[PDB]
Amino acid sequence: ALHVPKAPGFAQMLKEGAKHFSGLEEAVYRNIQACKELAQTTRTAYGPNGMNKMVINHLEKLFVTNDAATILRELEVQHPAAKMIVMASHMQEQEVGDGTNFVLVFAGALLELAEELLRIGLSVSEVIEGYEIACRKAHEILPNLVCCSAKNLRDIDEVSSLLRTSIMSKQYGNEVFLAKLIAQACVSIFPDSGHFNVDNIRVCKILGSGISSSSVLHGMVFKKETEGDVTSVKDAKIAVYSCPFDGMITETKGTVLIKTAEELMNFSKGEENLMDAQVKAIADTGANVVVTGGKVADMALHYANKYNIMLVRLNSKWDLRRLCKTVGATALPRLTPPVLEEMGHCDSVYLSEVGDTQVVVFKHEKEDGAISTIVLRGSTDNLMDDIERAVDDGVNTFKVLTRDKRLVPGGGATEIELAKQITSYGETCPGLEQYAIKKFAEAFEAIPRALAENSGVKANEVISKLYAVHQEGNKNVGLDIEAEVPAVKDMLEAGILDTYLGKYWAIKLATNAAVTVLRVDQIIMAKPA
Amino acid sequence: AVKTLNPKAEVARAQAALAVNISAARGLQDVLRTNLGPKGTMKMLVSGAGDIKLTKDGNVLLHEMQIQHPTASLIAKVATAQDDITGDGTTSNVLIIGELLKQADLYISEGLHPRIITEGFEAAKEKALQFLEEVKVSREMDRETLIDVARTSLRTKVHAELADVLTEAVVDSILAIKKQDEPIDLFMIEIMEMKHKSETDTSLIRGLVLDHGARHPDMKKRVEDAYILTCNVSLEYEKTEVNSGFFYKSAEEREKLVKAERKFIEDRVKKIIELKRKVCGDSDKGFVVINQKGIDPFSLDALSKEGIVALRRAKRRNMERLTLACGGVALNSFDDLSPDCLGHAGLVYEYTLGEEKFTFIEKCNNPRSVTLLIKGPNKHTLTQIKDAVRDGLRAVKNAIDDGCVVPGAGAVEVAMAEALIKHKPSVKGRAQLGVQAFADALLIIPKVLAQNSGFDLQETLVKIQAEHSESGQLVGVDLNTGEPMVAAEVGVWDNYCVKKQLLHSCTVIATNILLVDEIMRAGMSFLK
Amino acid sequence: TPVILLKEGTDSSQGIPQLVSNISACQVIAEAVRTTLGPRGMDKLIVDGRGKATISNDGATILKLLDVVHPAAKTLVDIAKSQDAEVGDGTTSVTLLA
Amino acid sequence: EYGRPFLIIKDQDRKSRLMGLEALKSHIMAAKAVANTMRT
Numbered sequence A: 001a002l003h004v005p006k007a008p009g010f011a012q013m014l015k016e017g018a019k020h021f022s023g024l025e026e027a028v029y030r031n032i033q034a035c036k037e038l039a040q041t042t043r044t045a046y047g048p049n050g051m052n053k054m055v056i057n058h059l060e061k062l063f064v065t066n067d068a069a070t071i072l073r074e075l076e077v078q079h080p081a082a083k084m085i086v087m088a089s090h091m092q093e094q095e096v097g098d099g100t101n102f103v104l105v106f107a108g109a110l111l112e113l114a115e116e117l118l119r120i121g122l123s124v125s126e127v128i129e130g131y132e133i134a135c136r137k138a139h140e141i142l143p144n145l146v147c148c149s150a151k152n153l154r155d156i157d158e159v160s161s162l163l164r165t166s167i168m169s170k171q172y173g174n175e176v177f178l179a180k181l182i183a184q185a186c187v188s189i190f191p192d193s194g195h196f197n198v199d200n201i202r203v204c205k206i207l208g209s210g211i212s213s214s215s216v217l218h219g220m221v222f223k224k225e226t227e228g229d230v231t232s233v234k235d236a237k238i239a240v241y242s243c244p245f246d247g248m249i250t251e252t253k254g255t256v257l258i259k260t261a262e263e264l265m266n267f268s269k270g271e272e273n274l275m276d277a278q279v280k281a282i283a284d285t286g287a288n289v290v291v292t293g294g295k296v297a298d299m300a301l302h303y304a305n306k307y308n309i310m311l312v313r314l315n316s317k318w319d320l321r322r323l324c325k326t327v328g329a330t331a332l333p334r335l336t337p338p339v340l341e342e343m344g345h346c347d348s349v350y351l352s353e354v355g356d357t358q359v360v361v362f363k364h365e366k367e368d369g370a371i372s373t374i375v376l377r378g379s380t381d382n383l384m385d386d387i388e389r390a391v392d393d394g395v396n397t398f399k400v401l402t403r404d405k406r407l408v409p410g411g412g413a414t415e416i417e418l419a420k421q422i423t424s425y426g427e428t429c430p431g432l433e434q435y436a437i438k439k440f441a442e443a444f445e446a447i448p449r450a451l452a453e454n455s456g457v458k459a460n461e462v463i464s465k466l467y468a469v470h471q472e473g474n475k476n477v478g479l480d481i482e483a484e485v486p487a488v489k490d491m492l493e494a495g496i497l498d499t500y501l502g503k504y505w506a507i508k509l510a511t512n513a514a515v516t517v518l519r520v521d522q523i524i525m526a527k528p529a
Numbered sequence B: 001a002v003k004t005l006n007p008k009a010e011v012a013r014a015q016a017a018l019a020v021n022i023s024a025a026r027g028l029q030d031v032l033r034t035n036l037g038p039k040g041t042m043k044m045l046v047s048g049a050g051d052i053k054l055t056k057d058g059n060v061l062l063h064e065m066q067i068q069h070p071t072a073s074l075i076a077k078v079a080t081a082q083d084d085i086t087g088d089g090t091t092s093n094v095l096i097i098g099e100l101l102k103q104a105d106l107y108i109s110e111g112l113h114p115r116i117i118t119e120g121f122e123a124a125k126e127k128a129l130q131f132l133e134e135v136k137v138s139r140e141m142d143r144e145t146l147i148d149v150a151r152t153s154l155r156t157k158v159h160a161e162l163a164d165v166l167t168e169a170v171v172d173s174i175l176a177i178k179k180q181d182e183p184i185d186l187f188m189i190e191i192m193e194m195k196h197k198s199e200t201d202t203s204l205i206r207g208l209v210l211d212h213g214a215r216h217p218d219m220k221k222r223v224e225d226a227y228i229l230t231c232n233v234s235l236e237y238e239k240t241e242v243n244s245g246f247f248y249k250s251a252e253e254r255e256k257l258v259k260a261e262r263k264f265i266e267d268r269v270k271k272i273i274e275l276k277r278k279v280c281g282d283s284d285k286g287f288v289v290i291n292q293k294g295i296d297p298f299s300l301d302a303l304s305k306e307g308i309v310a311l312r313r314a315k316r317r318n319m320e321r322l323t324l325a326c327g328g329v330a331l332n333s334f335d336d337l338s339p340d341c342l343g344h345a346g347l348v349y350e351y352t353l354g355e356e357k358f359t360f361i362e363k364c365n366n367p368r369s370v371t372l373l374i375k376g377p378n379k380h381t382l383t384q385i386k387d388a389v390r391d392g393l394r395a396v397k398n399a400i401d402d403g404c405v406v407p408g409a410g411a412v413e414v415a416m417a418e419a420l421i422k423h424k425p426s427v428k429g430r431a432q433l434g435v436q437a438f439a440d441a442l443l444i445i446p447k448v449l450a451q452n453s454g455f456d457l458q459e460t461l462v463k464i465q466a467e468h469s470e471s472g473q474l475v476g477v478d479l480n481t482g483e484p485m486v487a488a489e490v491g492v493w494d495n496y497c498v499k500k501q502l503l504h505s506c507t508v509i510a511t512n513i514l515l516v517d518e519i520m521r522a523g524m525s526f527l528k
Numbered sequence C: 001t002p003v004i005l006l007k008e009g010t011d012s013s014q015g016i017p018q019l020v021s022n023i024s025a026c027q028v029i030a031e032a033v034r035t036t037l038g039p040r041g042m043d044k045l046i047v048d049g050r051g052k053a054t055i056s057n058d059g060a061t062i063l064k065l066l067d068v069v070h071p072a073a074k075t076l077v078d079i080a081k082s083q084d085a086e087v088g089d090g091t092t093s094v095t096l097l098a
Numbered sequence D: 001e002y003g004r005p006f007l008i009i010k011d012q013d014r015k016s017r018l019m020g021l022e023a024l025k026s027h028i029m030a031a032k033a034v035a036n037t038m039r040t
């Protein structure tokens, strides 16, 4: 038989292993297919009824999770368009901290509809301009849907109710307990005239009993042991050092040079006397506990035991700073008797044991403090990891509420209203860009549908009833999860809400990613290495 | 001939070498022709590691496509040389080279020697340069003309909404760092990028942004009225150049030597503290130290106990920029420290972004150095914006450096072609044919533009040539109606040095390619 | 099909069959230690790669020495370890119960 | 749902097992052999 040799020009100068795709049929449609596959991968984990997923990475580590960002991080994607979608989702996670699945669902829907718009006859530029016009209109419409702005962010009973919705979709069936725990921990440290910093909430995981035995502590817990023979204090003055608890020496090489016998006899006694004087001078200021970030010498430990000083060491360079913030102490690079202003104060310091784990606890009787800790108890490491992820989501929700106080209804009410008003706007646009606009509105129906598909009901009836009830003027009506037959419910009365800022950023980033993917026309790929 | 000496050699003789060169040039232009104009399409490039790059630049596309050809290497080097001097015009270069070679081959395939076409090329080049010397427009170079030039050069890289944002920043920075002499010096405009807050937030700052902050927890995060000290003296532990060691007798001597080995740096820290106390008596103003060398935790502690913000290991070039912005003196020693050496800054503050820290110095009196702060949600977005910013800055600088600007959209090419057609009767011999070829090549710029807008090449070109023949106005293509338009009135402007350099380079490289007799690979296969 | 979504060699299973398979594997794990319960319980002997042997009646030890790699089955080992850590007795009743 | 061969134990295809009286009986045999070496 015969062969089709090659085409002259660029096809003959291309290296071996490289690829070149050009045109709509070889570039655009294949990208749309890849994005659709990526969206279908994570669609099933949306909402309170979304099911858990289990992933094993290339190092044989195990993840059991519902969060979309973690799932995308643990997978190994190869197609560039899916990489753009993943990067958009990660940017949304970094900017806000919740709503990394709305991005994927919306972008997939937008590209899926753009495929048929291109099939019918429209050009890519018109689709793009319609999408931008619709996005601007949606951002204009959104502020009018806001209801129930947050009133007081230092009231425990209101904060507990505001954070319940963000955790219900991760730990359905345990939302009240975790919500109350996170509310206490967050209300503890919010400072007046204060930026709320997220770092100041710490999580400690100890294997043991069920989740319901978890607790919150106003202070710190370290998984360490005491170096000395004193074990507890009842009123602690704390001195913190970043240098080793030992006799300090020259930076340049130094040798002890002796010429007579008497110096040889007296050297060790001189060193011991100096070390004793230093320890006694430190102790005379009233410090009961010394915390260091380096080595402790044997003689220094012996003299600390002589004068009843609790000695703890930890080597992280970051736990030391956080402890200094917790107790109000200032680190010292020298081994000198500290001044009163550099004293830390703690109500209790003690060594305890929880379920085979030995810990050292710095505990305050104060209600505010500077940082706080959450102690989690579970029967499996994966469960505690999932609970930690839920805690992070709740804390980020509190931070966003600090930034902006406005809430919008959830459960699909906002998306239905946006789609209705965008369709109404698009019916009055004369030109070819109206079709694109209408498609944009239809892309908002993928959010309620998914919910219904996860709840085990028929999405078409739910969407029809939502449209029918929104035609009458009820803007706060969404899907009812408890019912086994399709139904609708008032979300404002039932307290299902979500932040304005999250929805704003989600819409923006999803539209940006979809348009960026649509703009690419031809692809040149090097050979994988 | 060489085969009898080196059996492994590869050769291409007279009629085959020309075919190889022409084929490769056409292959390159067939790919690079889809970039020209604001209606060009965007390319995605993925390397072996898996990183993504979206681009439309000619130079980037040339240097990131997988190609192994000799004449392709020649053309890539020519494009790089053009880019490094002018910064704009790396696609038209390739297009014109390819079309010139194709037109020359059209006549060579009929039995004509290439030297005739070469002589025609030279004569046509001289005539075209003379014509371009009289088409140009000289102006005052006010802010509005520079706005037009920068916008024209920027709409071909990004969409309109972002171009309207980048134009103001580019023009404002170039005007801000300019003196009425002493030609414009870049490197006084620092490009910094932060990955957040979608790219419509790209901005210009009349100060500096430094990608590092204060390393002590007890330093103030915001300073309202600050003196700026800029130095490169070291506050780290330093040792003698000659070998040395300590020889003590007991513990007390060891302690004495330990405290003795720090005075050489404690003296410098005390000098700084004394100067700060002398100048900032009451605790109302601020004091900020920017150092190019390291600082110990001991020196950091000593400085922070007084209320000093200190940064270590700033980049070398900043040593100049701060001096031009804050207005002090960058000093290497502390033996003459006085209040003239200090600069002034009206706001100093810090911003934390994830794992990174940034420091903003703002509200200077008359800063001669400014910063372009890029923002966006991805990395390829920032890279593309950076390339666009480079193009715009080079365009504005070239506009100011010359006293003239040239109308665009293809008007000058049509004018040159029409002027060249009436010049060829004068010359003698077959060289006229070569002149003809040159003229046709100059029409590759309008044609492609029309073909990128969805029109037909020939009828639109005929419409364009219908004008400029009865009304001598410089007319070009209108990329949304296809009708002729007066380029100058609309606001489409092109640089003069770019066109001159482009003509010179294209003619030289095409002439040198057309005279190659045979291609040889007879040396050592590898240098091993 | 020209360019695939995930890396070659990624294995995926979903639906009722994978849940039924997980339930099936848990039965094998529970059967491993089933007959060591009560006043009339035997004990097991396990040999490792080097040749050393270990004879035990404690459920947590036996589950530890088995090189289980099934992701659904590792949970039963984890709960046995947790029970051993917390109370110290009853590390076989929990496995049979689950 | 076709419970096709699924992996539970590492190196499942090479490891062996003995359960019940047979295992017990094997032990006895070994012991007897050792004793019958020392009896003389």
Ligand SMILES: Nc1ncnc2c1ncn2[C@@H]1O[C@H](COP(=O)(O)OP(=O)(O)O)[C@@H](O)[C@H]1O
Binding pocket: A045, A046, A047, A048, A050, A068, A098, A099, A100, A101, A102, A103, A165, A168, A169, A170, A410, A411, A412, A451, A479, A481, A496, A498
């Ligand atoms: N009680 C509830 N009833 C119905 N829908 C809910 C309820 N609580 C939360 N949701 C919905 O869950 C959706 C998001 O869940 P989640 O899986 O966290 O997605 P994402 O991670 O993208 O926010 C929200 O759109 C919200 O409307």
Ligand SMILES: Nc1ncnc2c1ncn2[C@@H]1O[C@H](COP(=O)(O)OP(=O)(O)O)[C@@H](O)[C@H]1O
Binding pocket: B035, B036, B037, B038, B040, B058, B088, B089, B090, B091, B092, B093, B152, B155, B156, B408, B409, B410, B445, B449, B477, B478, B479, B492, B494
């Ligand atoms: N608005 C416009 N209308 C018509 N032509 C334009 C317009 N903007 C730019 N051009 C033309 O585009 C050409 C430059 O295209 P560009 O893609 O920037 O590549 P390069 O500048 O590297 O050759 C110029 O010749 C200019 O005449």
Ligand SMILES: [Mg+2]
Binding pocket: A098, A099, A100, A169
């Ligand atoms: Mg969510």
Ligand SMILES: [Mg+2]
Binding pocket: B088, B089, B153, B156, B391
């Ligand atoms: Mg350009």
Ligand SMILES: [Mg+2]
Binding pocket: C089, C090, C091
């Ligand atoms: Mg028991």
